[model samples]
Target chain A: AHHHHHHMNRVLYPGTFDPITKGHGDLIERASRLFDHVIIAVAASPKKNPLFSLEQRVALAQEVTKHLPNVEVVGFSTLLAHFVKEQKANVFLRGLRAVSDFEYEFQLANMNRQLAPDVESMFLTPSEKYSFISSTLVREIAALGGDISKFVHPAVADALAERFK
Target chain B: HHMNRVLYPGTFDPITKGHGDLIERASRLFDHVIIAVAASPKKNPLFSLEQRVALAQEVTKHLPNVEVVGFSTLLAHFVKEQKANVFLRGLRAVSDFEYEFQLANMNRQLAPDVESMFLTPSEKYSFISSTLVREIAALGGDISKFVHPAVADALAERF
Candidate 1:
C-alpha cells in the first residue's frame, strides 16, 4: 500500500540500445525522473544484426544509467507485449526523433496497444542537439573511424572504439 | 523593429496534441506564429477546412502570439505574403525529414528569403498523430490521450 502509486507508474523503455547513445541516455534520465521505476529493456534484436550483443548492450545501459537509482537494465527476447505484461509495466516507452521514426512508431504503438491493452505507449523526444543521432548512424561513423564521443557516453564511446578498431 | 514570424503549414485534419505541441513551442521561439491550415481538396480530409481552422484556433487559444488561418494557395506565395522569414515544419521521424527537405529546397527556389526550420515534438506528443487519432476514434478506441476534448468531440461527432 505504501508504494501503490509507485507501482502503478512503472515504465518500460525498450530499445536495441546497440551501444546506447547519449540520445538514449537523455530519455532514460528523463524517464527516471517522471516514473517510479524505469526499466531499460534492451532487445536481443538478432534480426537487425546489432553491433553489440544483448548482454553487452544491457551492460552498457547499466553503466550509462548507473546514477539513476530508480532505473534498471534487463535483456528480453520474448515478444514485447508479453515482456511488458510480465514486468507489470503500465507504460511502454519509445523515443521519437524523426518523421520516419513517427510513422513506424505509430504503427508499432497501435499494434502494441492492441496486443497489450493494459499498457500505454509513450514517446519521448531528445534534445535538439541529439535529434539526429541514431544507433545506425553512430555505428557507421565508428566503423568509418569518425568521432562518436559527442553522440554517445564515454563507456559507449570506448566500446565502439574497441569494437571498430 | 524586426519580427521573426514562423509559417507552420499542414493539413491539420484535426489538430492533434502533436501539432499543438509544435505550435506551442513555435509560439515561444518566434515573435509571431501563423498556423497555415491547407484546404487540400485533393486529399479529401475528414474535417472541413473551416472546422480544421476552428479546432486549431481553439486548441492554441492560450498562446497570445499564435494565429490560425486557412489557405489554398501555394505555400511559397503564402510565405511571401505573410512576410514570414521562417517556414516551420515539425520533424517527427526520418521519413518526414527527406520529404520536408525536398519541400524546403523547392520553397527556397520559389522564395529566396524564407528559410525552412524544423522542430521536433516532445516525446509524449511524438506518437500522437491526427491520422492515428482519427483511425482510433473511428474504431471507437480511446483518443482522450491524443487530442484535446474539443478535437475529441469533433472527431466523435464526425465518426
Candidate 2:
C-alpha cells in the first residue's frame, strides 16, 4: 500500500500570474489533484505594474483550470496570511522553477510562517521542459517578436500577441 | 593593463561537451581561464581527482588560454589565492541559476574583490549533465553525443 488519505486538504496558490504561463498552468493542474481544494490566489499587485488587470488574471486562471472541479480562482489585495486565514487554507502551494527560486522562496515561506504558523508551505516542480520558463521570460519573448507558441496557452499567446503587436 | 583572469570551478569527473562549451566561451572573453577541477569526495565521484583533472586538461588542451588544475579547499579561498579576478559559472537551467545565485552571493562576501560572472550554455548542450553522463556510461550507453572521445574512453575503461 502506497498511502491512505486522511485530512481534507486545502491549498492556497498565490501569484501575479499575468496571463498564466505554461509553467504556472502545469503546477496548478498538478496541485488540483493533490489537494482537495485548490485556490489560485491572483494578487492585485499594482506596484509591480502587471501586464494584465486583476480581473483578466483571475479570468485567465479560471479558463486554464475550469475543468478541475476542486479549483477556485480569486483576486486578493490584503496580506496573503490574512487571506489564508479567511479561506481556512492549511497549505501554501508554490512552484519551483530552479535552484535560484530556492533562497527567495525559503525566505518567503519563513516570513509566511512568521505571519501564520498554522499554515504549511509546499513546493511543486514543473516538468523539465517548462523549468526554464517564467512570466518574465514569456513576456520578454513576446515583446521581442519571438515565437512563444510552446511556452503559453493559445488564449494567453493570443492576448500577448495582441498586447505586443 | 586589465587582465580578465577567470576561475571556472567544478567537479569535472570526465568533463562533458557542455563544460567545454563554457570553457570555450570563457577562453574567448578572458585572458586566462583556469578550469578548477574540484576534488569532491562527498560526491563519491566516478573518477579519481587526478583522473578528473587529467581528463579536463586533455579535453581543454586545444584552448591556449585554458588551463586545468585540481583543488580541494574552499572555492572562495581558492579564487582569491590563485589571483583570479572573476569566478565563472555556467547556467544550464533555472535550478542551476538558483544554486549559483546563492553561491555567487556567498562568494562575493568571502572574496570581495573577485566578481562572480555567469554564462548560459548553448541551447543544444543545455540538457547534457555530468551526472547523467556518468549514469549512461555506467549502463554501457553511448555517450559520444555528450562527452569527448577521451572521456568516453576513460568512462569505458572504468565502467
Candidate 3:
C-alpha cells in the first residue's frame, strides 16, 4: 500500500475580535496575498474578560470581512498551536506595533516554533495610523463618550457608541 | 577607526574541533576574537571551569587573533568587558532554535547594543557536537569520526 501527502499551505490569523477593526482588515488583506487560504480564528479564553460572546464576535468578524473570499472565520477553544494544526495551517500570522509587544510576541513565537518545528510565524507591521489602536483602547474611548470613528469602521463605531450609551 | 571585537561564548566542557570551527569562522569577521568559557548553571558539567578554559585555549592556539577567558555570570557582561560588539552562537540542529531564540532575546535585553551572529558547522562536522562526543566517550563508543585524534586520545585516556 502507498500513502499520499497533503501539501497545501494554510495560514492562521487569530484575534479576540471583541469587535473587528480596520487594523485587522489590513492584516487579512495583506495575509491573503501570501497564503492560499487564511483562517481568521476567534479564540475564547477563560481567563479573559470578554465584552462579547464568542458567537457574537464571530458574527461581527464575518460581517466586517464579508468581501474577503479567501478568509474564513471560526471559533476555537484549543491551544493556538493545536488549533493551527487542526486547521492544517503551516504558517501563523501576527501583527506587531512596538517594542513591548515584540518581547511577548517573540517569546510566544519561540515557544510555538519549538512546539511545531514545521510551522513558521510571519509578522506584519500595522500602518503607522493604526499603530496605537486596539479594541481595548476603542472601548475606553467609547466609555468616555469620545469619538472612535478613526479607530474602527462606521458600523463598528456605531455599535460601540450604542453599546456604551 | 575602532577594531571589531567578537566573543564566541560556549560551554566548552571539553572543547572539540566543532568549537574550533566557530573560532576560525569568527576570526575572519573580527579583528580580535575572544573564546569565552561560559557556565550554564542549569547543567552540572563533568569538567571544571579551569579545565574547560585550558582545553579551549589549547585547541584555539593556532588562531593568533583568538583569546580564551572565563565568566561566571551573564555573557553580555563578558562581551562588554572584552569590548566586543558581536557574539557568536553555533547551531547544530533544528532543536536548538527555541533555546537559542530565548537566549538571544535575553542577551539583547541585557545589552541592547550587542548583536548575535550564528554560524552553521561544516557538513562533515555538522552532527559532531560536544554533548554527543561526551556521551560517546562515556559509553566507550567510537568517536574518531566526531573529534580530532588528540581529543579522541584524551577521551580514551580518561574513559
For DockQ, the strongest prediction is 1
- Residue pairs with backbone overlap in model 3: none
Range of the 10 consecutive residues with the lowest summed lDDT in candidate 3 chain A: A1-10
Q: Which ranges in model 1 have alpha carbons more than 4 Å from their true place?
A: A1-7, B1-159
- Which portions of model 2 show Cα errors greater than 4 Å? A1-165
Across A71-153, the per-residue lDDT of candidate 2 in tens digits comes to 99999999999999998887787775543355576568667878986676655555556767878888888999998989988
Q: Per-model C-alpha lDDT, please? A: 0.79, 0.79, 0.72
Off by over 4 Å in 3: A1-8, B1-159
TM-score of chain B of 3: 0.90
Ranking by lDDT: 1, 2, 3
Docking class of 2: incorrect
Q: Considering every candidate listed, which one attains the maximal TM-score?
A: 1
True contacts kept of each: 0.07, 0.05, 0.00
Candidate 1 CAPRI level: incorrect
Pairs with backbone N, CA or C atoms under 3 Å apart (clashes), candidate 2: A98-B94, A98-B95, A99-B95, A99-B98, A100-B98
